[PDB]
Design a protein around this ligand. Structure first.
Ligand SMILES: Nc1nc2c(ncn2[C@@H]2O[C@H](COP(=O)(O)OP(=O)(O)OP(=O)(O)O)[C@@H](O)[C@H]2O)c(=O)[nH]1
Ligand SMILES: Nc1nc2c(ncn2[C@@H]2O[C@H](COP(=O)(O)OP(=O)(O)O)[C@@H](O)[C@H]2O)c(=O)[nH]1
Ligand SMILES: Nc1nc2c(ncn2[C@@H]2O[C@H](COP(=O)(O)OP(=O)(O)O)[C@@H](O)[C@H]2O)c(=O)[nH]1
Ligand SMILES: [Mg+2]
Lengths: 425, 79, 439, 50, 425
């Protein structure tokens, strides 16, 4: 089993970088390429996210892609930087002024041809290919746009591998770009098109998580990005470490996504305690379920207590008993009866790996398709509606080769989904 | 360096097979070199005690060769 | 006495041969260069070298082989290698320019330059032998000197020794995996020799022995060496009776009249049985039963072809080692008891057997494990027309557009010959299909 | 086998025999460079004295 | 078996000046001519490319031809240029002028007799000669004009000997000689019926592979000569080293020339890294086979993706099994079979040699016969006829004995040459 990682965009690339460290340490590769680790349960599956390099060296399977050249230098000049291969750092010249357009019809194009060539070598090399993977935002031509292109093109050359975009949905309060509403709407259509499990994360929630559970006094994008790194490291765990109830990326999808169109899920790490309560707490399978469901954790800003929980998953890591997991999972499915659709309740999917996260008796990740995501695709649609009506900052998107109908087809797809969700509440 | 110590001797195999240290025409362990042809791997290492066959059943025509000279018995005689 | 000149023509042969003569020396005690490392003057009544090694007059035990190839690169490697002092400088004939993948530069132009020296050496190597059973030609059925020179020699070996024998262990143009692009051509024209001036062609395709190393053995990424050692052990098992003793031994003449039926269908197969690598053996019981059942198993044939697409005409089974006669008969029964393995309507008994006594020789530094049993099943099958089909089809995908045909015509081969070849195989093709039809 | 060795030292004896005279060519070639340069200057000093 | 080397022109002399460096880098010959004892398989076949001298010294069988001593003032003053024998240094007094007419007709006869005398004297000192070979320039006049005068002269008295040439072809994008399409369409008119094999060397192909792949900051003509000499030493490796499946220069042409007017090929050297990417790459067979199809490391500047391969041969140097040589090549037959001719499942020569060059555990070089040569030929014919229609630069040829019937017949079989590629596409 193997999985490529196409970090496109700044949000994406910087997220990809931190993730590669949280994937290295766990496996044991050092900030160069040598295995200076411990057990064999750390090199028995370095074939998945990693490759091989003459002389006990391990290059990450990645196709770093972004326009503004600066991004790549930052990654290289970062920590685990030289690990990435030089001929996979495919970057561009002129940047895309946060225009979903430029990165899909203008700049992206010239590079997209090349990006797919580097991505080809990576995939063509390995025989099996569980699925691809992409890390992007949803509010700039780099990640939101160029990506949707590097997902469409990829899905049409490889239409059987599990795609998985850990996108960062646009935010409600903590905004940053005024063309963000547009950037996102014109994008969700392409994700709702062909993406197996688009895990949606929201800067807002991640922030609160760092201001109540991590009690951090000042969360810098470093920390905020680390939390998402844990989720990117807790879905592919059953693919690179032993387990008592294995569950790879594909399985998770089949036993999660109900109809082939609800592929927007929310994340959640488990033992995320402040440094002043790790002493007062007792990691026990139970205590790893309250800090697992409690709205706060869910990193998407869509309190599931509003809508219903379509299908819930829990890829618990660590060394726990499954009678305990199974029970402390049923207690939930039962007790909270409304949320889990009462008429057709989705017995939460549970999986248990053994190799835990470096320094943490037990751990777990959470994926829960919830009929509440609506209050996220919806807000981005009210923001589109407003600006679109009085054709707002459209003289830039139209001035790229895009027409106007495209925007209406976009708004249609989004509200089409909003109903496709409400029709299960 | 003796096959009677390590294997079970067959008591009839030739004593050439008893110790393989006499096979002195093989290579004298010159590995690593870059200019080493893959066809030089033919008999690259000397056979040891752990190779020698357990039994050996040769076809002695010594009885056959001492009789097959000339012709067989023919009755040219006067009975 | 029972002797057999071993001819190796072409790089392909010289290589399979450099592998055959090590499994021939190490089989006996011949040192890398003759001089049998003797000691205690106690006699041993060998006489088992008189099937492949001829004693000179000073303990050099010289081989009765004749390596020959135009290009002087594969035959010079032997003339300066671990076996530099085994062959007589003259028995390793060489040339100067290769046949550059061209049947013409092998049976027309160059060739003639050496078909007089090579024949002379085979002649002076024939008058010193006291029982020339038959020659064991080793040529590539798909290349220059391989097909080119073999034609010249094979023809010049029937216009003289005629009443004799010529068993041919040829490499077969593989289905897909192919190195030579002028290969399809250089083969439909070499069937103009094997279908006439030969006796039995144990064709062995590279693709098959390029996967049996992956499934059975675990050697992944196998090179020619490995291939040669396996295509060098079959020849041993087939030529053992002529030396080592046992029970129901089988000479070459007899191994033919118990196999090749009508005077043409004489193209068998070859399947060494205990080919499991060491790692495995430890966990298995290579017994007469499994050694024989795992002989008629699709994924074990040395030529890429389904055995379940053709009735097996005859089957010469050459066993070696501890093979209690009873156990052999048992297997043959079970084999005919099975139904997947189908036989013909013109060979009730069909299968023939034979038990030598010597165990399998374990070439030092090898992949095949040290088993106390082994069975090489030469198998004549009507399905060989499958590996024959592909070739003819590919031939007609090229000779239809006069492709790579100037090079050949230039060195001497009127395009008329190419056509005369295509139909030649049409006959042998119809032949196999025909010999399958029943009253 | 010793005759093959003895023929090899004939070439090695002959190896230094050419290298003896190849030096002589370079030694001779440097002599005319000084012979030109001496004739360069003794024509100088006599061209100016006149 | 042996092949003599002969070179005419400035570009021929400069290429061979470092070709004799890279061929003595393998045989271990210092820039005087003595052996440096490294292996017996390093001089056992030195007869092929070197001649014996008065003990110890090994003289090359090289003859150098030009109309000026300018490029010969540098081939002797180079770090390895004392090795040549001075009687083979054949030069004229007056230069040509980058023109075919003055180099083939008027001053050709004053030098072709002296060159033909010294190439016969070297040929008579042979045991068995497989053929001749030339390096020259098509855009120039000394390498193209008198260079193809020696093509026609040698073919007269050596008909049954294979004779290949390594010619640099005129540039697609940026020109060097103003009259270079006149020189090429005259030279290509002559080499197409005479040379058994020929190799196209595009200068922008050398610049594309030096910028994108090997990444030199300031490329010079030394590194370009390194790459053209490596693939020219690599094709002929099986002549002088043993291998378990060899291929001399004569087995190549019978394998790649199906039609007598179809022998224009495409070379390439497989392992080419930068100083950074050397470390992040395991140097084995599957990484080298499917990478040669990648057009970025191609040395053609006219990709086969707008053409069709006809027959391709790769000779492999080093200790490698050919199970994975065949298995990876059939993997790059079936995955992309449209660009190959569909009537042959395997149109590939695979050849192997057991002696790799120093510094690389295994190496490879390939020769390709494709359709995209006609894209070079169609473009250079319209480049020629754009200036031929207006009688532009033509009187400089007619002043040296050149009429118009030979030019209208040089474009005629060039038009027949572009016509004999469309039906095979
Ligand atoms: N199985 C096996 N086949 C080999 C081996 N060596 C060469 N071959 C076969 O030989 C073919 C290559 O052409 P050859 O028959 O060797 O050509 P050649 O004998 O050198 O004759 P010329 O090239 O014309 O001089 C390949 O298709 C292989 O099938 C080997 O070691 N094992
Ligand atoms: N959660 C999170 N958000 C980020 C990260 N890096 C950047 N962002 C935010 O994501 C938003 C989108 O940025 P992006 O679209 O990548 O900018 P662009 O590439 O120039 O178009 C910005 O407003 C950033 O504040 C990160 O590592 N984690
Ligand atoms: N690869 C390589 N090409 C060269 C070199 N010198 C010149 N050329 C090429 O030769 C072409 C011009 O050839 P020219 O000098 O006119 O040949 P001449 O008439 O024989 O002297 C140019 O397009 C150059 O690209 C060199 O050292 N290496
Ligand atoms: Mg050959």
């Amino acid at each position: 089993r193997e999985i490529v990682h196409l970090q496109a965009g700044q949000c994406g690339n910087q997220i990809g970088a931190k993730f590669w460290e949280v994937i290295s340490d766990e496996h044991g590769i050092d900030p160069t390429g040598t295995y200076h680790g411990d057990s064999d349960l750390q090199l028995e599956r370095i074939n998945v996210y990693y490759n091989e390099a003459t002389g006990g060296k391990y290059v990450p399977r990645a196709v770093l892609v972004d326009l503004e050249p600066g991004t790549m230098d930052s990654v290289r000049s970062g920590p685990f930087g030289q690990i990435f291969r030089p001929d996979n750092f495919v970057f561009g010249q002129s940047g895309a002024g946060n225009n979903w357009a430029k990165g899909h019809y203008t700049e992206g194009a010239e590079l997209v041809d090349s990006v797919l060539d580097v991505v080809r070598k990576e995939a063509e090399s390995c025989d099996c290919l569980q699925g691809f993977q992409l890390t992007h935002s949803l509010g700039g031509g780099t990640g939101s746009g160029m990506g949707t292109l590097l997902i469409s093109k990829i899905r049409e050359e490889y239409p059987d591998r599990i795609m998985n975009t850990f996108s960062v949905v646009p935010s409600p309060k903590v905004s940053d770009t005024v063309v963000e509403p547009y950037n996102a709407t014109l994008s969700v259509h392409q994700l709702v098109e062909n993406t197996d499990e688009t895990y949606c994360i929201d800067n807002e929630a991640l922030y609160d998580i760092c201001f109540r559970t991590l009690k951090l006094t000042t969360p810098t994008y470093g920390d905020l990005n680390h939390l998402v790194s844990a989720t990117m490291s807790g879905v592919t765990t059953c693919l690179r470490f032993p387990g008592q109830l294995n569950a790879d990326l594909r399985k998770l999808a089949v036993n999660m996504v109900p109809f082939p169109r609800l592929h927007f899920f929310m994340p959640g790490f488990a033992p995320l305690t402040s440094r002043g309560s790790q002493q007062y707490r007792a990691l026990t399978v139970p205590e790893l379920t309250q800090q697992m469901f409690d709205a706060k954790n869910m990193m998407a800003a869509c309190d599931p207590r509003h809508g219903r929980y379509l299908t819930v998953a829990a890829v618990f890591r660590g060394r726990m008993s499954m009678k305990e997991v199974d029970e402390q999972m049923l207690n939930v499915q039962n007790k909270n009866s409304s949320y889990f659709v009462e008429w057709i309740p989705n017995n939460v999917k549970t999986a248990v790996c053994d190799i835990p996260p470096r320094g943490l008796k037990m751990s777990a990740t959470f994926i829960g398709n919830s009929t509440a995501i609506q209050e996220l695709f919806k807000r981005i649609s009210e923001q589109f509606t407003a600006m679109f009506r009085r054709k707002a900052f459209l003289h830039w998107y139209t001035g790229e080769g895009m027409d106007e109908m495209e925007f209406t087809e976009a708004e249609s797809n989004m509200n089409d989904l909003v109903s496709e969700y409400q029709q299960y509440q | 360096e003796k096959t009677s110590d390590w294997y079970r001797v067959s008591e009839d195999l030739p004593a050439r097979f008893n110790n393989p240290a006499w096979f002195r025409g093989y290579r004298t362990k010159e590995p690593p070199s870059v200019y080493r042809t893959s066809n030089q791997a033919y008999g690259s290492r000397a056979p040891t005690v752990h190779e020698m066959p357990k039994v050996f059943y040769p076809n002695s025509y010594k009885f056959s060769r001492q009789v097959a000279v000339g012709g067989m018995f023919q009755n040219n005689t006067l009975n | 006495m029972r002797e057999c000149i071993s001819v190796h023509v072409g790089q392909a042969g010289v290589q399979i041969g450099n592998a055959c003569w090590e499994l021939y020396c190490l089989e006996h005690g011949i040192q890398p260069d003759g001089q049998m490392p003797s000691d205690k003057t106690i006699g041993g009544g060998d006489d088992s070298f008189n099937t492949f090694f001829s004693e000179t007059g000073a303990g050099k035990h010289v081989p009765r082989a004749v390596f020959v190839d135009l290009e002087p690169t594969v035959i010079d490697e032997v003339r300066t290698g671990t076996y530099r002092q085994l062959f007589h400088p003259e028995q390793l004939i060489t040339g100067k320019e290769d046949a550059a993948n061209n049947y013409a530069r092998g049976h027309y132009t160059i060739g003639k330059e050496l078909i007089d020296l090579v024949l002379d050496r085979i002649r002076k190597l024939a008058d010193q032998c006291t029982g020339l059973q038959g020659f064991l030609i080793f040529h590539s059925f798909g290349g220059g000197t391989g097909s080119g020179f073999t034609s010249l020699l094979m023809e010049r070996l029937s216009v003289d020794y005629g009443k004799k024998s010529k068993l041919e262990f040829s490499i077969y143009p593989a289905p897909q995996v192919s190195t030579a692009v002028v290969e399809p051509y250089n083969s439909i024209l070499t069937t103009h020799t094997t279908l006439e001036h030969s006796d039995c062609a144990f064709m062995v395709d590279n693709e098959a022995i390029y996967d049996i190393c992956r499934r059975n053995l675990d050697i992944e990424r196998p090179t020619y060496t490995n291939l040669n050692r396996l295509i060098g052990q079959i020849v041993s098992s087939i030529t053992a009776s002529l030396r080592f003793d046992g029970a129901l031994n089988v000479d070459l003449t007899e191994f033919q009249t118990n196999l090749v039926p009508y005077p043409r269908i004489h193209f068998p197969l070859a399947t060494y049985a205990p080919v499991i690598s060491a790692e495995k053996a430890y966990h298995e019981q290579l017994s007469v039963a499994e050694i024989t059942n795992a002989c008629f198993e699709p994924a074990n044939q040395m030529v890429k072809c389904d055995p379940r697409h053709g009735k097996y005409m005859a089957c010469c089974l050459l066993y070696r080692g501890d093979v209690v006669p009873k156990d052999v008969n048992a297997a043959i029964a079970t084999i005919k008891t099975k139904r997947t393995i189908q036989f013909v309507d013109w060979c009730p008994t069909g299968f023939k057997v034979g038990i030598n006594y010597q165990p399998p020789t374990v070439v030092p530094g090898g992949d095949l494990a040290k088993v106390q049993r082994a069975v090489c099943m030469l198998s004549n099958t009507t399905a060989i027309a499958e590996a024959w089909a592909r070739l003819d089809h590919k031939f007609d995908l090229m000779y239809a557009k006069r492709a790579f045909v100037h090079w050949y015509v230039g060195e001497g081969m009127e395009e008329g010959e190419f056509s005369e070849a295509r139909e030649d195989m049409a006959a042998l093709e119809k032949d196999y299909e025909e010999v399958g039809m029943d009253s | 086998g010793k005759k093959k060795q003895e023929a090899y030292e004939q070439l090695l004896k002959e190896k230094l025999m050419i290298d003896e005279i190849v030096r002589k060519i370079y030694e001779e070639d440097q002599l005319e460079r000084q012979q030109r340069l001496e004739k360069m200057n003794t024509t100088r000093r006599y061209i100016e004295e006149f």
